[PDB]
Write a protein that binds this ligand. Structure first.
Ligand SMILES: *[C@@H]1O[C@H](CO)[C@@H](O[C@@H]2O[C@H](CO)[C@@H](O)[C@H](O)[C@H]2NC(C)=O)[C@H](O)[C@H]1NC(C)=O
Length: 199
């Protein structure tokens, strides 16, 4: 059976993907790539005929998609709108058709976040709130302590998708350096550190 893999499965905006088809039958009459599944005429990206080397761009072409005779499709300069599933439909020497599906997700890279704190000097048993300042909607926020992952406890409280970390009551051992790290499957950035002095 044929199998495709996205190269890469997760893709930055403006980068490329190869839809890499393994085990394309050798005796294909033609194949064609369609946006989404199941196969529809509107969705046709490209149609390639084996014997004649003839390409015809469908309604879904956007001037970025290149087909190779080995079945694989290169999409260059991707957008988040290109996310989703794609199908190759293959007609054999007779006129029998087979399908194969593949998907890939494309993300915008995360922007550089900042770390503000309510107060650097604070008294044991006070509260303190750290805020990860990012414009990035729907990004993954993780917290760090002296360059390693923060072990969360009963004393802590994450709000607004982890951008607000409040610690209460603070303790002798919370003294250290804090960063927030912001990520998606394609990119990651760390904030400035905030040093914290306890008394
Ligand atoms: C099918 O065709 C494509 C393009 O001819 C091949 O992809 C290239 O091969 C290697 C492996 O990914 C890379 O060094 C090239 O840069 C690739 N081209 C790209 C990403 O456009 C692919 O290997 C071929 N082979 C198959 C399907 O077995």
């Amino acid at each position: 059976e044929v199998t495709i893999e996205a190269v890469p499965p997760q893709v930055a905006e403006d980068n490329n993907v190869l839809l890499l088809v393994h085990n394309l039958p050798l005796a294909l009459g033609a194949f064609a790539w369609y946006k989404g599944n199941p196969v529809s005429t509107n969705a046709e990206i490209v149609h390639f005929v084996t014997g004649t080397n003839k390409t015809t761009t469908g309604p879904a072409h956007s001037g970025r998609e290149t087909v190779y005779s080995n079945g694989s499709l290169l999409i260059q300069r991707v957008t988040v709108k290109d996310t989703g599933v794609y199908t190759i439909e293959m007609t054999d020497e007779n006129f029998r058709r087979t399908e194969a599906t593949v998907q890939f997700h494309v993300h915008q890279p995360v922007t550089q976040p900042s770390l503000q704190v309510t107060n650097t000097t604070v008294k044991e048993l006070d509260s303190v709130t750290l805020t990860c300042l990012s414009n990035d909607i729907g990004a993954n926020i993780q917290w760090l302590f002296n360059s390693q992952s923060l072990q969360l406890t009963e004393r802590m409280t994450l709000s607004q998708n982890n951008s607000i970390l409040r610690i209460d009551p603070i303790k002798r051992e919370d003294a250290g350096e804090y960063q927030c790290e912001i990520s998606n499957p394609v990119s990651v950035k760390r904030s400035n550190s905030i040093k914290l002095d306890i008394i």
